[PDB]
Structure formats: C-alpha cells, structure tokens
Ligand binder design. Structure first.
Ligand SMILES: Nc1ncnc2c1ncn2[C@@H]1O[C@H](COP(=O)(O)OP(=O)(O)O)[C@@H](O)[C@H]1O
Ligand SMILES: Nc1ncnc2c1ncn2[C@@H]1O[C@H](COP(=O)(O)OP(=O)(O)O)[C@@H](O)[C@H]1O
Ligand SMILES: Nc1ncnc2c1ncn2[C@@H]1O[C@H](COP(=O)(O)OP(=O)(O)O)[C@@H](O)[C@H]1O
Lengths: 59, 370, 59, 370, 370
C-alpha cells in the first residue's frame, strides 16, 4: 500500500506536468506566430516610413 | 480579548480564533437523525448527531444540510451546528468573544437579521459582524484590486473590487456549486451501472468527485481521446470493496461549471460571467481587473481549472490585455484566512455591532450600518 | 513487481517532462523578449513615420 | 412492411404488430428450470420452460426473471425469451420486420448496446429502435404535455414533457415497483401465519396482491377502522384449498408506494417525487404539468390510487392550481399502445437504425444518434 | 396607395396602416429558440418563434431581444421580426406599401443604412423613410413647440423643438429605460427571497413592474412610511400559484429614473437632464419649453411620474415660470400615432426615398437628404 500511494503521487505529478507541458507548447507556438506578425508589421512600417522619406527628401 | 471567525458555508464549517493561520475546526455542516428502530436497550440513543460524528454513524442516519444555497433554511439545525462549533470543537464560551460571521452577497435580509438575533440572544456574544466572503478572500490574497470568483458548496459569485472599492452593480451571483456537481455526478454514474441514491451514498460520491475529477483543457478532443483509448480510466474503491472505474465522467462532472446547460440551467459558464462582470465595470479599471482574477473556495480546486479559465477568458477578452488567474495552493480556506486577518486589525475594532447597539435598534441594525 | 516498474516509469516520465518544461519555458521567455523588442521597434517605426508625415505636411 | 413492438418490461412481455389496438401476446417474462429428479423414462424432458408454460409447470420449476430493475441481468435467458416471443407467440420471422424495443430512462448504456447487438446479430432484424416508456405512454394518452408517472414491475419513473420537449434534468427514477410490493406482502403475511418462500409461492402472492389490495385514502383512520371492525377482511383460496383471510394487509401493501420507509428505503413517496420533478421545471410550464399527471403501468392499477395521489399532490401544490390525475382504464398497456402508434407514423420511418448503419458504426450507433 | 408605420422600439413592435387611430399589431420584439431535447417524433418542431407566440412557449425557449439599446445588434432576428410583422400580423405584401420606420436620435449611421438596405433589398418596398421618435410624439401631442421626453425600453432622450425647428445641439440621450428597471427589480427582489434568473422569469418580473410599481412623490419619507406601517404591500401571483408580496420595492424600482446611481450610473436623473437640455437652448424659447414638457413611451407610464417630474423641475427652474408636464393617457403609442399622422400628410408624399433614388445612390441616401 505504500508502493500504491507513491505510485499515486507519481501519476498525479505526471498528469499535472503533462497538462502544463501542453499548455506551454501551445503558448510557445502562439508566441512564434506573434513573432511572425511583428516581423510583418515592422516590414509594413518600414515601407511606409521609407515612402514618406522619399517624398520629403524630394520636396 | 480575542475574537472568533466562523465562516459557515453550505458544505463545511471552518471556525477558529482571530489571529491564527488556519481554522482550528473544519467539519461538515450536517445534522443526522436515525432512521431505523433501535433495539439494544441501554445504548444511549442520541436524538441527533452533528458534524463529523454524523459522518461516521453515516450508515444509519439520514443527513440534512441546514444551508441550501447560501441561505439557512433550518434554523434549529443551524443552531445545533453553532452550539456544537462553540462548545465541542472550539471549547470556548460564546459570551467572551466577538464573532465574525460570513455571508454570500445578494441573499435575503432575513438571513442576516435572524443570524444576528440568534447570536445576540441564544449565545450572548459581546459583539458580532457579518462580512462578505469575497472581500475576505481578497484580504487573504494580499491585494486591494481584483475580481474574485468564490465557488463553495452552494453558490458561485464574482465580486469586482478596485482600490478597496466595491462595484455592487457588477456583482454577479450564480447558483451552481459543489453540490450540483455532486448531483450531476450521481446521475452520470448511473449510465455506467452504479447507483447511489441515499444521502450517505451522496457523501461517497462527493469523495469520488474530490479525488478523481479534473477540468479538461479542451473538452471536445478530450472526449474523443477518452473514447479512443482507455488511459483516462481510474479506479475507486467504495467502503465495502466493490471497485468502480470511471472514464470520461472524470471531466464531464466539472465541465458543468463551463456549460451549465448540462444540468438544464440557462446561465453562462463561470468564465463568461466573469467576463461579463468585468465588462460591467468602468473602462479604466478593467485592465487591472483582467490581471487579478482571484480564485477561491473548494469548487475551484479541480486540477486544470486555472488553465481552462485563463484560456477561456483570453479567448473572450481583447488580444492585448494580460489575463492572470491567481489560484493559491490553499485557496480553499481563503475566506477564513481573510476573516482572521480582518478581525485582527486594530482599526476594525470600531466596526463590531456591540450588544448595546442591538438592544437599542433591534435586529435591523445589521444591514443598517454594518 | 508491478508497483516497482510503474513507479520507475513514472519517475522517468517525471524527469523527461521536467527537463522539457525547463527548456520550453526558457525558449518561451526568450522568444517573448524577442517579441518585446519587436514591439518596441514597431513603436519607434511608427513614431519616425509620424515625424516624416509631419515634415511632409509642413513642406 | 409492418413492424413489431416488443415492450419488454420486468414482469410481463407485451408484443404485437405496429398498427393494432392491443398487444397480441402478453405472457410473464420468466424462465423456469426443473429442480427435481425426473424418473419417467421417455417423458421428453425439456431443459427450460419460458413464458406461461413455465407458469403452469411452476410446481416443479425454479422461476427466474432475467430483468431485475429494468436492467437485463441474464442475457441468455433474455435471448430465450425473445426467441419465444418471435417464434412461438407471434409466429413470425424476425428477418422481415423492424422491431421497436423499449427501455426505462437512466439505466446503463451497455443495456441498449447489448439489445441492439443481440437484435442485429442473432435475429437479423432489418432495423430497430429503442424508445422511452414514458414518451410512448404520453403518445397513448393522446397528449403532448404532461408529467407521466410510469410504474411497472421493476422501476418507477417520472418524465415531464412540454409541447413535445423533454426535461431530462427533471427525470426522476425510483427503484421500488410491483416486485418490491410483492416481497413486502410476502413478508407481511407471515404475521398471520401464512408462509410463502418458494418462487411459485411468490407468484401466488403476486396474484393475491393483484386481487385484494387497494390504496387507502387516509392511512391512519383506515388503520383504526380495520382495527375496530372486521368489515375489511376478504378471503382468498390458494390452489389447494386452504382459504386465507387478510385484513389491513390489503392496504398496507400498496401504501409502501407513499411511505417507502416501510421497506427500509430512504426515498420519498411517489406523490412527493412527482411534486419534486414538477418543481424542478421552469416556472411557466408547471401550471400545465399540474393538470396532466398521466399514470401508467401495472403498479398504478390499485383501486383508489388516483384519489390518494390527487389528495397528496393537492396538499403539496399551491392552493390555486387544478390538479388532475389522468388514469385511463387501460393504463396497463399504454406503453405498448403508444409504441404501436409511434411505429405506425409515416414520419418515423426515417428514425429506424438500419442494418447498414449498424454495420458501419458498431453497436454504439444506438445512443449516439438514435 | 396606403403606407405602413412600423415603430420598432426595443421592447414592443407597433405596426399599422397610415391613417388609423392606433397600431393594428402590438407584440413583443422577441425571438425564441428551444433549449431542451424534443422527443415527440412528429410534433413539427419549429426552429424559432417570434412575437407573442414565443411568449406562450416561453417555458421551453430562450428569448432574445434583437435590439439592445435602440441599436439593432442581431440582423437575422430583426429580419425575422420584420418578416413576421409584414406577413403574419399585418398580412400584406411589402412590395405595395411605402414603409415609415422609426429610430432614436444619436445612434450609429450603420443602423439606418442597414435598415434601408434590408427594406429595399429583401422586401422591395416602393419607398421608405426613417423618422425621429420625438418629432412623431410631438405630432401626436398636437403641438409644434415643446421639449419631449421619450422613454421606451432601451433609451431615454429629450428633444427640444420650437416652432417646428429642432435644436440638435441640445438633444440629450440617456441609456437607462424599462429594461434596466426590470433588471434592477430582478436584483432587488432577491433581498426578499425571490429568485428570478431566466429570461422567462425576466418577463414575469417585467409584468410585476408594470402592475405594482409607482413613483413616490417624496422618496425619503415614503421610505420611512413603508418601514413604519405595512400598508404599501401588495401581493402578486406567479403563474404557478406562489403568491409573493413586495413592499418598498414598488417605488424603489422606478426611482432609478431620478437617481441613476442606484444601478451604478454616473448620469443625472431625467428631471435634471430635462432641465439641462432646456438651459442649453436660447434664452427666449425656454419660457415656452418649460410649459410644454411632453412625456412619451412606456417607461413614462408609472403612476405619479408626472407629479414628481413637475415637483423636481419646479424646484430647479426659476420661481416664476410655469412648469407644465403634459402626459396623455395614451402616451404609450404617441410615436406610432404621430407616425401615422405624418405618413398621412399630403405634403409629406415628396419626402419618401423612392426605390430609384436608392438604386442610384446606394444605402447612404438615407441620411443625405432624408
Ligand atoms: N479537492 C477538491 N476537488 C474538487 N472539489 C472539491 C475539492 N475539495 C472540495 N471540493 C468541493 O468543494 C465543496 C466544499 O467547498 P467549500 O469551500 O468548503 O464550500 P463552502 O465554502 O460552502 O463550505 C464540496 O462540495 C466539494 O464537492
Ligand atoms: N390489477 C392490479 N392491481 C395491482 N397491481 C397489479 C395489477 N396488475 C398488475 N399489477 C402489478 O404490476 C406488475 C406488472 O405490471 P407491468 O406494467 O406489466 O410491469 P412491466 O411493464 O415491468 O412488465 C406486477 O408486478 C403486478 O404486481
Ligand atoms: N403600465 C406600465 N407601467 C410601467 N412601465 C411600463 C408600463 N407599460 C410598459 N412599461 C415599460 O415600458 C417598456 C415598453 O415601452 P415601449 O414604449 O414599448 O418601449 P419601446 O417603444 O422601446 O418598445 C417595458 O419594458 C415596460 O417595462
């Protein structure tokens, strides 16, 4: 019965650790998608600021 | 002179002394009476058993909770439970201690009026006071700003606080809690063969719920997974042998908190009512409410409830604000801990309802100033 | 016997999943500081673009 | 092609053809096996007798019901009973008829899964379907709204329906029925000297129950009246002579339906569970539920049960509602009648579980869609 | 050809024919959908019920208003309601009638744009037009000068008019109306023990509000009187029996119109917003505005609201000018009555938005000229 209760606490730790693992994996994938979005947005901002710089240096 | 904290609750009495770190007495809020005949002359048959003595003689008794949904519906049994708490569990004299009782928000006035009348008359407390469980939970969490989600045995309620100010128009009270999950589990277990109909069997099912149930992060594919393999099945042993095994019931029981339609209620899940209570507050404080969700009570103790709550509120709220679910590891006693902290404050010693004030104003003094 | 082997399997799952949580949370926070600096870069880009709009509306 | 209706029940098989007005075959759901020696060489000993052949030879047989509390607990005996029903009673070929079986609510899933697997494999029915007894009883009553109290041999249940919508959270299932009353009467007759212990004697006591028992309108003064005079005593003649006379047992036996503590159960009487199932429904439909209590099943056939039911519910409900207990004179076959009506509807011919759907989906198809 | 008037509002649809004296059809603006299972095969289950048919199947449906605060937020349900209004209630063809729709002031442009697009496309009306509720209420009152306070189910607004000229800078729109009073009453009834949480129960509480509530002339001593005696208590009977009695709630509910802080709003009472909208007008016309306060809409139907309004505005205004609250006995239909009058005018027949004008200028024609 001691072995039983140790195995029980073991499987408890296993379940909770796997739950937080899956949560953190989804978090990491979402963070990577966020990085992609930020690369896209900085790209667009660079383009627009550069167009305005062109016009300003022109005038 | 020290004071007493007596967080009543609909499932568990937690009492103790103002200033400690944990309640001194924690026992079921239950009163049992014998059903059967009684033959052995001289056994000293008691009329009724209270507390956890009624939990060990459980097999021959019919148990009754004197609190249904945060409302005391049997005042004699509640008086029995209070008498027990004072004399046999704490072993004090109620005439030498102010008492800090606790109540849920948005429940009838007669509850507090009768509560204070009972105290002052049939216990002769020097003073008393009736707090709100959410405020005390915030005290125990060590904050002054946040939206708490207290979910005990009878009632689930949100209370948003900001800088120590309550938003009483945004308090949302819901009426499914531990007991409705216990009943839903008693019903779902029949579709696998097991039949629990007695009150004692309801206690057995409550223990099954406290041991084997958890909240699925994603209900649908969790359901499909439990259907595919059989790795989610655990076994439980009733107190006569008779091992039982449950599968998807483990997470189908607490899922009712997020889809209250499973028990035929029209309300929304706890995540949606939390979001609504937030969106009912002024636009400036809700960014700070989003990051101070304070979970409290026993029904918030399922494994994976904080993760599911955060996922749901994140899917609901704007995609910029930071959702933080604060679930302490001892969140089951936050109301009592906060009550002790409050009753221990120096600046609080003027808020008690002294016996003289009651003698002058009747039982209506309670909601009048306090 | 079954308890010994089940507890050993639970222990090795504990260890692997613990290291995985370690590495996952580290890579997560690092990608999140990357996200942070990208957001600040978005800010700088938008500000300089506003400046160029100012110069264009002036001249 | 016509379809079969096979209301199984735990005490009586009622089978027939969809479209008739009454079941074509009604026989006990029982299987008998010889217990004694067997000496006459060449008598042609059968291994087991089913139906009412086992009822006439019951002196030498040991009788067994393969259904205990609505649940089939002996699948070989149930297969024997179905084989009998199809080939010897109805005299058809199951390969040429869709079959409409019936089941009580809130009983294990494996029951329906095994039902449909048995049908499709060892009988090769073209299609089948498993209905709920209370819904069919409401069909037969000619209504679409009402709370129906079905009480057969194994299980008593309420199902509230409104406008054709079931309220599955208010379904209440109770597990005392005709058989527990038969056992209680067997136990109560010993205090007059009569001793029935055999299974055949259990059948004798069931007949005594069906002939001499009634529900007392007021239990206490009826008890005092039976104690005062002797005008309530009837006499019954066992099938060997030996006239027996019973007194207050006549109404003490069915009174257990209103005081289930007589057999040591903790539940409430049928009147109180009916009222509770009503009060568990939305406040707008319960005024129409109060006036459409539809009694069904054999155990609701005692003289004076409708009046006692109305008195009790009237005493429980508010003093403005109109309580109406609807008790048809043929209410013992309402489930079968409604099942025939249902299986005859043209719009129903798409709800069958065709053989091909089963071949694609396994036995799990039954509850998963239908 | 005759024209249609379709005053929508957020709580009640009022439709009719231009020229009549009262709306021909008056039904709730509700779309109901079933919650429960549905077991009677062949009952012909509709998908959704609208109007007062959804009000009779109330117990099994979940009701939804498609207009929240004067703004249409569910366009499919609004289209369902309009379809019902045209075909089942009025029984006409929308292709043969100009339609006069109605809207509150200071609400998004997309509202009118989508409204006219829906009309012209999915109903093919020959012409249409969108009026302002306050102007039509003035038409019905038979005046050309006055400040009209319209208070329906979603929005309260003041519009000051002089000699037929509007003062758009002095229009003040408030966002508490009948629905917020219904919610506040649902909340205040909990402190007596009564619990209403469902949408059907919200309709019950709305009926209680319409039958028992009134405005106190002086809130404070009325409160003291209600606390002293018990002569203010009436009794209402829910639709299952269960008599309930309410005391000071009767006037605590509509008092929120004069102290919107009871529901946690920062605005001022209707008397003070009326006085502010008056003082925002030119100093010459306000002497005539003070004497032409025209009440309109359902929420202005409480007993004693005119006297309280007059007392408050008199206390605010200078002590010489003559305050005069005009509250017709049929003020609940003033918007529709004025709409019929307006659509009947011969000189108005040039203001319609013909279908060809829309076919040229897109949906944006509505606020360009009309
Ligand atoms: N570890 C647990 N997991 C899940 N549920 C629990 C756990 N512990 C207690 N509960 C539930 O919480 C309820 C008791 O919570 P509690 O906070 O004491 O309620 P109250 O505050 O009303 O006394 C019980 O009904 C039980 O079902
Ligand atoms: N006339 C009667 N009076 C009282 N009880 C009856 C009568 N007829 C049948 N019963 C009871 O009803 C039971 C059979 O009812 P039935 O509806 O056929 O049950 P099931 O549906 O389970 O087969 C028997 O156990 C018997 O005790
Ligand atoms: N007799 C009454 N007393 C008090 N309030 C009423 C009465 N009749 C209706 N109401 C309130 O008025 C509202 C409906 O008013 P109505 O003018 O139809 O609004 P709308 O024009 O927006 O549909 C309801 O919500 C109800 O609360």
């Amino acid at each position: 019965e001691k072995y039983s209760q140790k195995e029980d606490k073991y499987e408890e730790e296993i379940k909770v650790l796997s739950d937080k693992l899956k949560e953190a994996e989804t978090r990491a994938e979402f963070a990577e998608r966020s990085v992609t979005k930020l690369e896209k947005s900085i790209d667009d901002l660079e383009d627009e600021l550069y167009a305005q710089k062109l016009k300003y240096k022109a005038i | 002179t020290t004071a007493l904290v007596c967080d009543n609750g609909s499932g568990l009495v937690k009492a103790g002394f103002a200033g400690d770190d944990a309640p001194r007495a924690v026992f079921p809020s239950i009163v049992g009476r014998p059903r059967h005949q009684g033959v052995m002359v001289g056994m000293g048959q008691k009329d009724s058993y209270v507390g956890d003595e009624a939990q060990s003689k459980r097999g021959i008794l019919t148990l009754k909770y004197p609190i249904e949904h945060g409302i005391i519906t049997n005042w004699d049994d509640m008086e029995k439970i209070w008498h027990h708490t004072f004399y046999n569990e704490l072993r004090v004299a109620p005439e030498e201690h102010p008492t800090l009782l606790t109540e849920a928000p948005l429940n009838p006035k007669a509850n507090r009026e009768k509560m204070t009348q009972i105290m002052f008359e049939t216990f002769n407390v020097p003073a008393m006071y009736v707090a709100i469980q959410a405020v005390l939970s915030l005290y125990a969490s060590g904050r002054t700003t946040g939206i708490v989600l207290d979910s005990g045995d009878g009632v689930t309620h949100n209370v948003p606080i900001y800088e120590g100010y309550a938003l009483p128009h945004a308090i949302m009270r819901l009426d499914l809690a531990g007991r409705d999950l216990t009943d839903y589990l008693m019903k779902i277990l029949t579709e696998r063969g097991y039949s629990f109909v007695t009150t004692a069997e309801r206690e057995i099912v409550r223990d099954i719920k406290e041991k084997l149930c958890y909240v699925a992060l994603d209900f649908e594919n969790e359901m499909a997974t439990a259907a595919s393999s059989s790795s989610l099945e655990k076994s439980y042993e009733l107190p006569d042998g008779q091992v039982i095994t449950i599968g998807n019931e483990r997470f189908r029981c607490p899922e009712t908190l997020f889809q209250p339609s499973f028990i035929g209620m029209e309300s929304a899940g706890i995540h949606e009512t939390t979001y609504n209570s937030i969106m009912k507050c002024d636009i400036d404080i809700r960014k700070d409410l989003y990051a101070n969700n304070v979970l409290s009570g026993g029904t918030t103790m399922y494994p994976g409830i904080a993760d599911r709550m955060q996922k749901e509120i994140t899917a609901l709220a704007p995609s910029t604000m930071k959702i933080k679910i604060i679930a302490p590891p001892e969140r089951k006693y936050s109301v009592w801990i906060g009550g002790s902290i409050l009753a221990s404050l120096s600046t609080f010693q003027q808020m008690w309802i002294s016996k003289q004030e009651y003698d002058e104003a009747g039982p209506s003094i309670v909601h009048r100033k306090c």
